[PDB]
Design a protein around this ligand. Structure first.
Ligand SMILES: Nc1ncnc2c1ncn2[C@@H]1O[C@H](COP(=O)(O)OP(=O)(O)O)[C@@H](O)[C@H]1O
Ligand SMILES: Nc1ncnc2c1ncn2[C@@H]1O[C@H](COP(=O)(O)OP(=O)(O)O)[C@@H](O)[C@H]1O
Ligand SMILES: Nc1ncnc2c1ncn2[C@@H]1O[C@H](COP(=O)(O)OP(=O)(O)O)[C@@H](O)[C@H]1O
Ligand SMILES: Nc1ncnc2c1ncn2[C@@H]1O[C@H](COP(=O)(O)OP(=O)(O)O)[C@@H](O)[C@H]1O
Ligand code: BEF
Ligand code: BEF
Ligand code: BEF
Ligand code: BEF
Ligand SMILES: [Mg+2]
Ligand SMILES: [Mg+2]
Ligand SMILES: [Mg+2]
Ligand SMILES: [Mg+2]
Lengths: 209, 561, 486
């Protein structure tokens, strides 16, 4: 978007020209609640610029034949504010819902986030998967990062203790793995990400669509 | 100036030096490999990195011919003279010897041929495209170009044959800054106790010529410091001052505390004078915030040994007048990270897209001179809920909060960005910003108790003369629902009563130092018109939000494995 | 014009004069230390501070070659002529001697290369950026620039080598205004009874260039006083009156009372005429307001000895028709600080963020020419609590409240900003703005009793003829529920 006249549509025009030039490609339109905003026609607006943006995106997305085979990917947080003119079958018809993780998906998230980490051999993640029911991957990453921060603080304390006892020898790191006490201390302030009413709104939208 | 002066960008220097020297020293290797070497390189990056110094070292090292072409130096008033000047420059670079052409500031030469409205600029771009690639294009000559913005260059000029290799000379690392410090301090006698390694590890956003500015400011402060024992000496400074000058470490510390990076000169904040002991109470919150800021900027080796990215955001919320802005000032005044301060509705504008452009420019300046720490005060003005207003300005605050959500988590590298939120009402915040990954540390700053109000009263009365018999235990025990703003109001009313008594004693002494400290009667008269700031309903609302956040922490126990 | 003419900015004067004078008198210190001195000055600040006077003194005393360049002076209608003019100017400055180049008003030849839309401006920016620091850039020449706004400059032009040391010639202090008064009143036959210390102490928010306007207005007032009594003699003026003219003290007092700072000329308050003796009753409220206003103004030494910041805010709430606006007018007449007044919805606009820009500009103008006192009338209008509407009007009143809370207590210096608020509805006020640091004194102005009723009856009847047998005690005792407006 630009404050000048014509540039706010010329940006979408030459971005889609660069997409049509390097075929095939993938155009990831992130956060479509700012481009494909709902109109709400009540005779009062800022002048009709978002309408021109939506119309330019519609006439630049309708000229997609079997040639040049581009693909447009969208990902929004609020699906209620998306235009039904851009959610029309024939222009953008697919709708994949990404739900909250289950027990096995949560265990897979906890196993994939701990790939390149020196984990303890006597440590299991099934208790973390079972004790947390309405959690998500972002706050699970927050839990793992707080455990890593506690392990780094313990390493710094052991290093300054070793320096004090040397000035007044352990291994290359006194805490070579993330212990269970670090996870038990990191899960003390482990809140959840999403509330309950947002899940009700997403379930209502999934039942409507 | 040789190749031992642009250290810190050794990879890009080798990438340039290969395609300049190897098809010029021994071209038999390229004649035996079968094909032609690349004959084009475009330097792009931030200003003050060393691209012009690298081109000058290229012109000074090789013994071949060198032609210098500036940006707007080719333009002329005659109709058809800039193309003739370009053709004559290319013919002089091709006819004499295999030469190197340097095109400095190409942004005034290539206006991308789709946004300009003139004719001479398009003629110059078409002449450059003709002379760079075509029939009788180039006969064993190379072209180098330097610019500040790479996006304002023509896509036909950013093609193979004309400019195929785009070297990226970015900001240096700590070892690069140490190398630049060792280069710029090799022609001067500094000290026997100067530490360039700690100086390189102390700076965080300096790039290129800023280290030379630091060294020149330290030397200028040393010269202005070592000129007070002797007079002005307008005739001649004798030989006793010329020898054994010395540039100690205190000059470098003063020049480091009295300077800023060249990219963050626009958003420089006023230096408030607080310390960590000025913020009374909040010991665990202060320690957790201080370690969360200082851990990834001092020990990155443990963070890449564990293989995880550090935490970035932290949000303070609670009753107003508690110490959120004071904690932000204490972070701004003494922590080694660069500080970009911004108010809530400050970055808005009446045009269409200028608010999102200002948000993108603020975040780009934050991630440019990384590590920076950002203080987004009053998030409830620009970052509200989405879809809550029926009548609006065409959906602009939704675009603002979408730009904030995208810049805080998107297709970014996320090198080192520490955003700080201090909002006195956490209800109007969007639920997608309180998600971890953007703002994970939701720190509730509660009201002080009897053990914290005493420390607040001790920190607020740090730089004042006080009565030796006066105690603050009765003041900490009498007030139970008070705050730090109320204690500051009590202290200010006691100081106003002491100033009134002092000026009354001064007027009586002038009619016919009387008050050396604040007595007990001043505090007893100041504690009569003192009330609490927050009421009982807002405290109940904050405890209800805290209990809702703790109910979001359900099914948690000792957690046996 | 010399170096003893720009007194008032000692640190900025020394910071300019160091790199101007020291690499020209004796370069042996720089030859021994090995490093090269900085060769760039950027003088930014408020308009009318002394940057052009500093450049003129540098041009007048330093014996090197000088070359002054105006802002839109190199611009020509030919394609490629402005850059040629800049190149010829720089080659003329480099050809003669080690010289000083003063490029004044650089906000017209540097539009940041991103917000502009032309091509000539970008080519002029590229010519300056190449000719100031490139290959064989500058052979012992120093560039000085002067600007009214430092933010609309290219960050590549705000770099080391081109413009590195940015001096801040800002708003002076009491001793700086005394130095400007002693400089500007050293050539006139002034008086034998005029003191400059009280004139420098009662002048608060002058930018340093209004002091000469003050002395010129005082001299013109004295000349106009001498021209009306004695005849003008339009053929030739009699030279007897020229030997005894002088400048008296009441001329300076009239010039002080008939002037204003140059930054507050757009928010000037209209001349109301009230008196502290014209506001009957409320003696404790009047003495508390006088204390709160005039303690950090008259005695800064006790506040900097105790090491504490003074209280600034005060709120007036109560029944209408009581004297809150009258107390604000009595403040606006005869305090020792400047006055900036607004109405309730006066600072609101229909665009997006223009009300925020108006709030930020009026608070920057209040804190720039410190000390000022701001009368925020109708805090019920300008500040709701938060989110009180079920359907929002675009989300703007909450942003106005947030900008008020940030400007009254945020990440600022907080030099001297007194906030006076007068409302008649304290239920719809934010508890975050009722909190100390912004508005701590919640002064309640009640209905008058019998003695306050008698004093307001004697004060409203101050300038009138009355019967000598008139007794106001029955009027003060019979009403017993009335107010000042009634
Ligand atoms: N990477 C660097 N290494 C060493 N010195 C540098 C570097 N970048 C800048 N400098 C210093 O700054 C001076 C000017 O740098 P220059 O190349 O003109 O800037 P730019 O990076 O904008 O092209 C150099 O002569 C040198 O003293
Ligand atoms: N814990 C505290 N210790 C010391 N002074 C405090 C404390 N809390 C508040 N104050 C004083 O009161 C002022 C108000 O605190 P501040 O951080 O500005 O409030 P808020 O949380 O509303 O942003 C501070 O600037 C300081 O002068
Ligand atoms: N600090 C000062 N000391 C002395 N004279 C000053 C000062 N500031 C302004 N003046 C006077 O103000 C008048 C106009 O100032 P001038 O330098 O032309 O403007 P500016 O500060 O905008 O560049 C001159 O008569 C000048 O002498
Ligand atoms: N306490 C008072 N003392 C003297 N005059 C008063 C008083 N209250 C009201 N008046 C008179 O009535 C007028 C109305 O008071 P004013 O301050 O304008 O209104 P308000 O009380 O609504 O702020 C005053 O201008 C003055 O002439
Ligand atoms: F990159 Be520099 F400013 F020439
Ligand atoms: F007044 Be504070 F910033 F909540
Ligand atoms: F030249 Be001044 F700063 F108006
Ligand atoms: F009507 Be008043 F200003 F209280
Ligand atoms: Mg350059
Ligand atoms: Mg605050
Ligand atoms: Mg000027
Ligand atoms: Mg009123």
């Amino acid at each position: 978007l630009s404050m000048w006249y014509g540039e706010s549509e010329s940006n979408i025009r030459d971005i889609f020209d660069k997409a049509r030039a390097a075929a095939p490609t993938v155009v990831f339109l992130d956060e479509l609640d700012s481009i494909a905003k709902a109109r709400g026609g009540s005779l009062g607006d800022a002048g009709g610029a978002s309408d021109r943006v939506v119309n330019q995106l519609l006439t630049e997305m309708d000229g997609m034949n079997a040639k040049k085979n581009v693909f447009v990917i969208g990902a929004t947080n609020r699906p209620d504010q998306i235009d039904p003119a851009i959610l029309r079958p024939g222009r953008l018809d697919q709708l994949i819902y990404v739900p909250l993780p289950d027990e096995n998906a949560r265990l897979s998230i906890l196993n994939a986030q701990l790939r390149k980490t020196p984990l303890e051999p006597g440590l299991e993640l099934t208790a973390i998967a079972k004790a947390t029911q309405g959690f998500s991957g972002a706050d699970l990453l927050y839990i793992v990062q707080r455990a890593a921060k506690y392990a780094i603080k313990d390493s710094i304390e052991a290093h300054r203790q070793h320096e004090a006892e040397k000035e007044v020898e352990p291994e290359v790191d006194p805490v070579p793995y993330i212990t269970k006490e670090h996870f038990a201390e990191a899960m003390k302030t482990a809140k959840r990400s999403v509330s309950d009413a947002e899940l009700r709104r997403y379930e209502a939208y999934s039942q409507q669509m | 100036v040789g190749y031992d002066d642009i250290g810190g960008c050794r990879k890009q220097m080798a990438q340039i030096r290969e395609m300049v020297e190897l098809p010029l020293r021994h071209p038999q290797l390229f004649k035996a490999i079968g094909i032609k070497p690349p004959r084009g390189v475009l330097m792009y990056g931030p200003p003050g990195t060393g691209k012009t110094l690298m081109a000058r070292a290229v012109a000074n090292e090789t013994g071949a011919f060198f032609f210098l072409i500036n940006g707007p130096e080719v333009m002329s008033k005659m109709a058809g003279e800039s193309e003739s000047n370009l053709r004559k420059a290319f013919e002089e670079a091709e006819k004499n010897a295999p030469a190197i052409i340097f095109i400095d500031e190409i942004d005034s030469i290539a206006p991308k041929r789709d946004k300009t409205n003139g004719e001479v600029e398009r003629r110059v771009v078409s002449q450059l495209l003709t002379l760079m690639d075509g029939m009788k294009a180039r006969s064993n000559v190379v072209v180098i170009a330097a610019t500040n913005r790479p996006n304002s260059i023509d896509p036909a000029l950013r093609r193979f044959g004309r400019f195929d290799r785009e070297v990226d000379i970015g900001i240096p690392d700590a070892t690069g800054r140490l190398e630049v410090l060792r280069i710029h301090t090799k022609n001067m006698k500094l000290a026997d106790d100067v530490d360039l390694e700690a100086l390189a590890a102390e700076t965080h956003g300096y790039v290129g010529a800023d280290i030379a500015s630091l060294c020149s400011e330290a030397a200028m402060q040393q010269i202005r410091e070592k000129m007070d024992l002797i007079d002005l000496d307008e005739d001649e400074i004798d030989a006793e001052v010329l020898d054994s000058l010395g540039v100690t470490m205190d000059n470098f510390r003063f020049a480091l505390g009295n300077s800023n990076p060249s990219a963050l000169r626009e958003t420089v904040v006023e230096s408030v004078n607080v310390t960590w002991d000025d913020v009374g109470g909040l010991d665990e919150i202060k320690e957790e915030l201080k370690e969360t800021v200082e851990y990834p900027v001092l020990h990155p080796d443990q963070y890449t040994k564990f293989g995880l990215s550090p935490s970035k955001g932290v949000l303070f919320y609670g009753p107003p007048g508690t110490g959120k802005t004071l904690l932000a000032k204490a972070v701004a005044t003494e922590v080694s990270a660069n500080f970009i301060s911004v108010k809530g509705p400050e970055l808005l504008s009446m045009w269409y897209g200028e608010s999102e452009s200002n948000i993108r420019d603020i975040f780009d300046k934050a991630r440019a001179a990384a590590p920076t720490v950002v203080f987004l005060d009053e998030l409830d003005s620009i970052a509200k809920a989405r879809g809550g207003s029926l009548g609006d300005a065409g959906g602009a605050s939704d675009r603002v909060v979408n730009q904030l959500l995208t810049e805080m988590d998107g297709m970014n590298a996320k090198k080192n960005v520490f955003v700080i939120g201090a909002t006195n009402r956490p209800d109007q915040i969007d639920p997608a910003i309180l998600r971890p990954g953007r703002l994970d540390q939701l720190i509730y700053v509660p009201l002080p108790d009897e053990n914290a109000r005493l420390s607040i009263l001790n920190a607020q009365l740090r730089k004042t003369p006080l009565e030796p018999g006066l105690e603050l235990t009765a003041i900490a025990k009498a007030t139970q629902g008070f705050s730090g703003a109320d204690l500051l109001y009590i202290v200010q009313r006691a100081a106003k009563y002491a100033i009134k008594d002092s000026i009354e004693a001064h007027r009586q002494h002038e009619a016919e130092d009387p008050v050396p400290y604040i007595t007990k009667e001043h505090f007893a008269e100041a504690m009569k018109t003192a009330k609490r700031s927050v009421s009982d309903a807002e405290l109940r609302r904050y405890e209800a939000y805290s209990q809702q956040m703790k109910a979001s922490r359900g099914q948690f126990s000792n957690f046996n494995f």
